[PDB]
Design an enzyme around this catalytic site. Structure first.
Site, PDB file in Angstrom:
ATOM      1  CB  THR A 128      -0.945   0.036   1.215  1.00  0.00           C
ATOM      2  OG1 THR A 128      -0.176  -0.008   2.423  1.00  0.00           O
ATOM      3  CG2 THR A 128      -1.905  -1.146   1.180  1.00  0.00           C
ATOM      4  CE  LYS A 154      -1.572  -3.352   4.114  1.00  0.00           C
ATOM      5  NZ  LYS A 154      -0.571  -3.757   3.089  1.00  0.00           N
ATOM      6  N   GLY A 195       1.493   4.180  10.404  1.00  0.00           N
ATOM      7  CA  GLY A 195       1.189   3.612   9.107  1.00  0.00           C
ATOM      8  C   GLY A 195       2.244   2.631   8.640  1.00  0.00           C
ATOM      9  CB  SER A 253       4.162   0.917  -4.930  1.00  0.00           C
ATOM     10  OG  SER A 253       2.785   1.248  -4.992  1.00  0.00           O
ATOM     11  CB  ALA A 302      -5.491   6.300  -6.040  1.00  0.00           C
ATOM     12  CB  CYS A 309       0.441   4.100  -8.267  1.00  0.00           C
ATOM     13  SG  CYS A 309       1.078   2.509  -7.686  1.00  0.00           S
TER      14      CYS A 309
END
Lengths: 176, 169, 173
Positions: free
Chosen positions: C1, C34, C46, C125, C158, C161
């Site tokens: 994530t 997370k 996190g 990522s 978002a 990626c």
């Protein structure tokens, strides 16, 4: 390269062809999320779909529309003529991507190997999440026939969106 | 190198790292590397690959623009066809931005022609970083100009991944 | 994530996406969480790694926060040495972002505790995508709160990626 996912189905005297909008280059970078690769041809009577390159889809769509005019919208005759011209073209013969064409009464899959196929159960899918949407569509066609052809097109692509990272839920359904 | 282009509020701009060149006028002019005006100054093109391949693609795209009377999409599709069909050019992984007063397009050796979602795209090493900065500015800082967005986006990409030249169309 | 933490104008926020693919390209979790609040909602944590190891690290850091009664810098340092010490947690190369009212820290299994440069830090990522959007908002949209910055920075990441979705959870202090 991933150029959206397209799902086609004929069900209950109706016809629909839907597609998501995600265009992904490589394995990690998204370049577009609202693409529309479904194209209407022959005075809005034929829906064609190609999840390949824009350069190849333009040549194929221009040749299929040309063949549709020659045979007055005869989907089957124009598809088999486009198929051998596809296989005859030595630049397009290398293409492994398939082309979906459909009118009110038939769905056809056209290949660069000259093959013209009516898919089983009157549905087919192409693109990165095509095999996922194809699986959901076969399930809905057999166990949820109460859904319309448009609902089947959106719901099967929605399943593919929730599973495939290369498929989003920006789904647009085209109906004949 | 990084190249960023954006259409915003009726104005177009493309930016990249700078250089001082001597042209036909034989007078020092600060230009952007691998950024050239084509079609009588009505379109702007940018390539992230080699400078030799950039001018090779710039000349091919201009002839296509002349063939199809300045239709950006029609010339971009034809260039993509000739791009994927060329021996040496189809191996290239760098993409080419083409842009006029009305639309932006990105052409790749794979044969793709993409119109970005919000008239905003960047290419090169820090391209995705400038794209992230530009998308944030396009939605939350719409008061900035197209040239300002181009300069600010490339600045953020440099701070993560100063000589920035912005070409206004 | 992808986790993104931002300190802006005396406020603190941390955002994380919820997509889990487990190394393939098939999504089996879309709403994973997370980013958790620890020390009775006084600090934010996190983890960019697995959902199960996140629970182990959150509990351990929760305990270290109790044993030092809120000192983030000491609790993170004692966590890193306990992280590097334990047999099963030492090989996890995913980093942990911890953050209280005053500072942001990045704990690693190597025993290192990093104090990042600015008040903007991201892991995962699509971390550099959110960081790029974060510096753009922090420079031209400072009217947004730290919470709005965290969500909007992750929304941009978002959309760019592949392995970062828009199911974003945002926690504030």
């Amino acid at each position: 390269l991933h150029a959206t996912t397209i799902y086609a189905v004929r069900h209950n005297g109706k016809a629909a062809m839907a597609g998501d909008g995600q265009v992904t280059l490589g394995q990690q970078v998204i370049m577009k999320q609202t693409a529309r690769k479904v194209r209407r041809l022959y005075e809005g009577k034929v829906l064609a779909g190609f999840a390949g390159s824009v350069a190849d889809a333009f040549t194929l769509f221009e040749k299929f529309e040309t063949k549709l005019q020659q045979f007055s919208g005869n989907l089957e005759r124009a598809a088999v003529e486009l198929a051998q011209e596809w296989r005859g073209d030595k630049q397009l013969r290398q293409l492994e991507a398939m082309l979906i064409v459909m009118d009110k009464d038939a769905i056809l899959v056209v290949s660069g190997t000259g093959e013209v196929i009516a898919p089983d159960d009157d549905l087919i899918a192409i693109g990165s999440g095509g095999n996922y949407a194809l699986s959901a569509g076969r399930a809905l066609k057999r166990h949820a026939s109460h859904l319309s052809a448009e609902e089947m097109a959106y719901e099967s692509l929605k399943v593919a969106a929730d599973i495939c990272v290369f498929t989003n839920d920006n789904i647009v359904v085209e109906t004949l």
